[PDB]
């Protein structure tokens, strides 16, 4: 059950564009949700080979994680900051969708999200 490749990052074609909300996701929002205790499980792509998980994308068609989103935000991938919004959206889901309501890794997921909304809620 071999990884995919992880999801594209960069697109020079892409045109680019600086906004108060775009800095504010990468500068506040990813930022913030980098250094929470229970982010380490969603700072890179799920490993699904190392972790034993040979179902993993069999389940997960969108994989997200918060590697994955700061580079985005860094390569200035997202013109539209719902982008992002969505990015992390699909982050949490996949972590409810994969595992099971209670789960260790729900909790933890359901904690970041909690934390993200705090943020967003903060959004220009
Ligand atoms: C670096 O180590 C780890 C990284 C990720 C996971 C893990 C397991 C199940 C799962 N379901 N959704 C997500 C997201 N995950 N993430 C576990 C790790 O170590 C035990």
Redo the contacts with the bound molecule.
């Keep these: 059950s071999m990884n995919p490749p992880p999801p594209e990052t960069s697109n020079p074609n892409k045109p680019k564009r600086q906004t108060n909300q775009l800095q504010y996701l990468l500068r506040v929002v990813l930022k913030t949700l980098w250094k929470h205790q229970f982010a ?3 700072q890179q792509p ?2 699904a080979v190392k ?1 034993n ?1 040979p179902d993993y994308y069999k389940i997960i068609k969108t994989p997200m994680d918060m590697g994955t989103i700061k580079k985005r935000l860094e390569n200035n991938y997202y013109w539209n900051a719902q982008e992002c919004i969505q990015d992390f959206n699909t982050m949490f889901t ?2 409810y969708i ?2 099971k309501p209670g789960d260790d ?1 729900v909790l933890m ?1 359901e904690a970041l999200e909690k934390l993200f909304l705090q943020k967003i809620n903060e959004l220009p």
């Design positions: 380490w499980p969603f799920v490993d972790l998980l996949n972590c994969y595992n890794i997921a």
